[PDB]
Write a protein that binds this ligand. Structure first.
Ligand code: NA
Length: 156
């Protein structure tokens, strides 16, 4: 089955602008996040079903993570993807889905609605520790994109 967790975060960047930057996560992420070295398309054209391979060098040792693009809704500022392979994925999980939806902020910013879905093998409830890592990962990407936009205002 599926275990679901919601999280909400705010930004000072307006949603249309953040969303445009998200589309460039593949090039933005390696620059901002020290451990991320590259993001490469294994299969597909960037649309749903696309598989991406992230190369990371935590410590001094290389690691791969695999993402699958699930859906996009540009009009509603949504990007959804799943972790589908790599040591990030525990054996009790078929996949971990990260959904991001941006809405308008009261003062010219955005509200990020982050949804985390764990598809477990035999309805294995996620660990306090596992979730913690998942919450941090989703929050980390959002901050990486936001940070790039705030640091490079002419870009978007
Ligand atoms: Na990097």
């Amino acid at each position: 089955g599926v275990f679901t967790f919601e999280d909400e975060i705010t930004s000072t960047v307006p949603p249309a602008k953040l969303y445009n930057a998200m589309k460039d996560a593949d090039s933005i992420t390696p620059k901002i996040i020290d451990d991320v070295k590259s993001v490469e398309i294994v299969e597909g054209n960037g649309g749903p079903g696309t598989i991406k391979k992230l190369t990371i060098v935590e410590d001094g040792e290389t690691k791969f993570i695999l993402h699958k693009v699930e859906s996009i809704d540009e009009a509603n500022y949504a990007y959804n993807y799943s972790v589908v392979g790599g040591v990030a994925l525990p054996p009790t999980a078929e996949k971990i889905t990260f959904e991001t939806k941006l809405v308008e902020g009261p003062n010219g910013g955005s509200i990020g609605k982050l949804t985390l879905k764990y598809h477990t093998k035999g309805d294995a409830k996620p660990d306090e520790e596992e979730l913690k890592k998942g919450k941090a990962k989703g929050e980390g990407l959002f901050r990486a994109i936001e940070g790039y936009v705030l640091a490079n205002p002419t870009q978007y």
